[PDB]
Amino acid sequence: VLYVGSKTKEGVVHGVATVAEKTKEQVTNVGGAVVTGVTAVAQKTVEGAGSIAAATGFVKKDQ
Amino acid sequence: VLYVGSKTKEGVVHGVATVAEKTKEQVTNVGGAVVTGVTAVAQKTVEGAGSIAAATGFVKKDQ
Amino acid sequence: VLYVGSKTKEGVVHGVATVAEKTKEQVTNVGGAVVTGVTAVAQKTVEGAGSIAAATGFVKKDQ
Amino acid sequence: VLYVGSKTKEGVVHGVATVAEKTKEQVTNVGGAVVTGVTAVAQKTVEGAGSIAAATGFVKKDQ
Amino acid sequence: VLYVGSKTKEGVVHGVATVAEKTKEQVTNVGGAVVTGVTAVAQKTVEGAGSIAAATGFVKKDQ
Amino acid sequence: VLYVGSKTKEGVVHGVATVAEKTKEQVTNVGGAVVTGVTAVAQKTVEGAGSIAAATGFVKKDQ
């Protein structure tokens, strides 16, 4: 491959405006992955799993 | 590969404005991964798992 | 590979403005990973796991 | 005009997020009023005409 | 006009986030008023006309 | 006009975040008023016209 005078944007996030107001939030997490709120994310991944919330573990919550 | 006079943006996050106001938040985490609030993230990962919240552990919460 | 006169941005975060106001936050973490507040992060990772909140441990919270 | 235990907002502007990017702007003003960009304004009492763009006055442009 | 135990906001501007980026701006002003960029303003009482751009006055531009 | 146990905000500007980046700006002013960049202003009482850009006065630009 070759590149000559040639721009290249990969995994880019731009121009994001937000206004949260009187938000109420309650999270109860047990061995999981939780993502909340405002979240701009630009994730280039190579030879590997790209994720915002990954839950791979073991949870025993018996009764 | 070769590059000549050639810009290249990878995993870039720009231009982010936010206004949180009278937000209330409660988190109860037990062995997990929690991410909240405002969160600009630019994550180039190579030969490895890219994630904002990863939960891989063991949790025993019996009763 | 070669590079001639050629800019290269990887894992870059820029231009972030935020205003938090009268925010209330309560966290109860037991053996996990919690990230809150305003969080600009530029994470280039190589041959390793890139994450903002990683929870890999063991938690025993029996009753 | 009494007030007892009573919150009161008069003339308020809050919670504003904006993102300009690669904007180009050219102004040629001759004896006028020009206002550009982001503009929060709050005025409780005003003893006149309220207006965003008010053009009184004389312009002579003969040829 | 009594006030008892009573909060009161008059003429207030809060919570403002902005991001300009690669902006280009050219102004040619001749005897006028130009206002650009970010502009929070708060005025409780004003004994006149309230306005963002007010153009009174005389302009003679003959040819 | 009595006040008893009573908070009061009049003419206030708070909580402002801004980010300019690679901005280019050119002004040619001849006998006018130019205001650029970030501009928080707070005035309780004003005995006149309240305005962001006010252009009174005479401009003669014959040819």
Side-chain angles (χ1 to χ4, degrees):
Chain A
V1 186
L2 66 97
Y3 288 79
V4 177
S6 57
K7 298 186 192 287
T8 301
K9 300 183 179 182
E10 301 171 359
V12 177
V13 172
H14 68 255
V16 173
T18 305
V19 175
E21 179 164 345
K22 301 196 180 178
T23 291
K24 300 187 189 189
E25 195 193 312
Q26 185 171 123
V27 181
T28 297
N29 178 223
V30 177
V34 176
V35 176
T36 335
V38 183
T39 304
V41 175
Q43 180 170 174
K44 188 173 188 313
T45 331
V46 173
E47 200 173 1
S51 191
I52 86 169
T56 325
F58 194 110
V59 175
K60 192 171 187 179
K61 191 190 170 75
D62 302 14
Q63 187 185 120
Chain B
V1 186
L2 66 97
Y3 288 79
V4 177
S6 57
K7 298 186 192 287
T8 301
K9 300 183 179 182
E10 301 171 359
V12 177
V13 172
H14 68 255
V16 173
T18 305
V19 175
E21 179 164 345
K22 301 196 180 178
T23 291
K24 300 187 189 189
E25 195 193 312
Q26 185 171 123
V27 181
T28 297
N29 178 223
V30 177
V34 176
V35 176
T36 335
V38 183
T39 304
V41 175
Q43 180 170 174
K44 188 173 188 313
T45 331
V46 173
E47 200 173 1
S51 191
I52 86 169
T56 325
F58 194 110
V59 175
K60 192 171 187 179
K61 191 190 170 75
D62 302 14
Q63 187 186 120
Chain C
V1 186
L2 66 97
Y3 288 79
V4 177
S6 57
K7 298 186 192 287
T8 301
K9 300 183 179 182
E10 301 171 359
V12 177
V13 172
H14 68 255
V16 173
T18 305
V19 175
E21 179 164 345
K22 301 196 180 178
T23 291
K24 300 187 189 189
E25 195 193 312
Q26 185 171 123
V27 181
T28 297
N29 178 223
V30 177
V34 176
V35 176
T36 335
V38 183
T39 304
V41 175
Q43 180 170 174
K44 188 173 188 313
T45 331
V46 173
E47 200 173 1
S51 191
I52 86 169
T56 325
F58 194 110
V59 175
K60 192 171 187 179
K61 191 190 170 75
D62 302 14
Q63 187 185 120
Chain D
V1 186
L2 68 97
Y3 289 74
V4 174
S6 58
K7 294 200 174 194
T8 300
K9 297 186 184 201
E10 309 179 356
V12 180
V13 174
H14 67 252
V16 175
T18 304
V19 178
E21 180 164 334
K22 301 203 185 179
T23 288
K24 299 185 187 200
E25 198 193 317
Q26 188 172 124
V27 180
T28 296
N29 178 225
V30 176
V34 176
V35 179
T36 329
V38 178
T39 307
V41 172
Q43 320 177 19
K44 177 190 145 163
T45 323
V46 168
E47 312 308 327
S51 56
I52 296 174
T56 325
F58 174 38
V59 176
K60 190 168 181 182
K61 191 175 181 176
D62 297 34
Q63 187 173 4
Chain E
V1 186
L2 68 97
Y3 289 74
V4 174
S6 58
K7 294 200 174 194
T8 300
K9 297 186 184 201
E10 309 179 356
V12 180
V13 174
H14 67 252
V16 175
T18 304
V19 178
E21 180 164 334
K22 301 203 185 179
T23 288
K24 299 185 187 200
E25 198 193 317
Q26 188 172 124
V27 180
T28 296
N29 178 225
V30 176
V34 176
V35 179
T36 329
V38 178
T39 307
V41 172
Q43 320 177 19
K44 177 190 145 163
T45 323
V46 168
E47 312 308 327
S51 56
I52 296 174
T56 325
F58 174 38
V59 176
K60 190 168 181 182
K61 191 175 181 176
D62 297 34
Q63 187 173 4
Chain F
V1 186
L2 68 97
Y3 289 74
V4 174
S6 58
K7 294 200 174 194
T8 300
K9 297 186 184 201
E10 309 179 356
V12 180
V13 174
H14 67 252
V16 175
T18 304
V19 178
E21 180 164 334
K22 301 203 185 179
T23 288
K24 299 185 187 200
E25 198 193 317
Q26 188 172 124
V27 180
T28 296
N29 178 225
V30 176
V34 176
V35 179
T36 329
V38 178
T39 307
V41 172
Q43 320 177 19
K44 177 190 145 163
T45 323
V46 168
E47 312 308 327
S51 56
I52 296 174
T56 325
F58 174 38
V59 176
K60 190 168 181 182
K61 191 175 181 176
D62 297 34
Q63 187 173 4

